[model samples]
Target: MNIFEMLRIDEGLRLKIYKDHEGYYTIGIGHLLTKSPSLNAAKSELDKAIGRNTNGVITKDEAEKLFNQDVDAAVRGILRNAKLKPVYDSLDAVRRAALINMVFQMGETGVAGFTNSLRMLQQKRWDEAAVNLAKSRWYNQHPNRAKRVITTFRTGTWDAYK
Candidate 1:
């Protein structure tokens, strides 16, 4: 299918892919995708758009543009931050993958703001990490979705590589 021709814009679907952060990106209200493009260039393009604006809102024409240097620069800044480095480092492969998923959903600050969570992980306190996961305003932003991610981190069995 040709995206340029088939990428129909839904009026009901407000520009949801806004906010630029590191390698993560938010596609819809709670929907997210990592930096590494899985499906195709379309998803990667959408990820870039998500990180370009914090509001998670975009115009049809703007969405069509897809690639922008300004957006790339902003995303680059996010990937270089110190606060997020630890989370990316300390997490297990599974949790790390899930963390990246969460990052795609909640920008760098929204995800990396978990100073206590990072500390708990560094201390190897799994329970504390779970608690810290629930102690977030993002849960209010997207309760069910947030819960799912928290569950993954807690269970250790959650496939973070989705």
Candidate 2:
């Protein structure tokens, strides 16, 4: 959890159910708890998560608990992934947090799908990686988030929070 501050800031604390413009049932610090085209379906998924449910609301620590779980899940998803092993191991804790946050926000298809950026990250080519990141489709949607991620990629420091 020591490594999650950047990610925590990026994923603001939301203690209730709120769908994004895209309609994913997101809550509690960007936890994509569940999503569906139908409102009831999304609520069903949330109920599934809550185990015994009512309208979604959670305490501050509960949200952080879920965030930690998701971060662990994110780490599990990527680690031992043969394709990303070397790239994963080459980075320090700061960069690894950046990497995990990227995958957490975007999912496997989104993060690993950036073909050229993968090569840049693997090669530790920071500038080239930035170029690819800046040019990526994600930057257009959440420019500040993308910018901070890219800055973390290049600076490899908490200063990226700036």
lDDT of 2: 0.79
Q: For residues 1-162, what per-residue lDDT tens digits would candidate 2 score against the true structure?
A: 345777888888888788875778888888886667666776666677666574677777777877888888788777756656567788887788888888899885567677788789888999899988889678888899988888888988878685
Task: List TM-score per model, in order.
Answer: 0.51, 0.91
Could you give the C-alpha RMSD of every candidate to the true structure, in order shown?
11.3, 1.7
Off by over 4 Å in 1: 1-79, 159-162
| Full-model lDDT for every candidate | 0.53, 0.79
Clashes of each: 8, 0
Best candidate (score: lDDT): 2
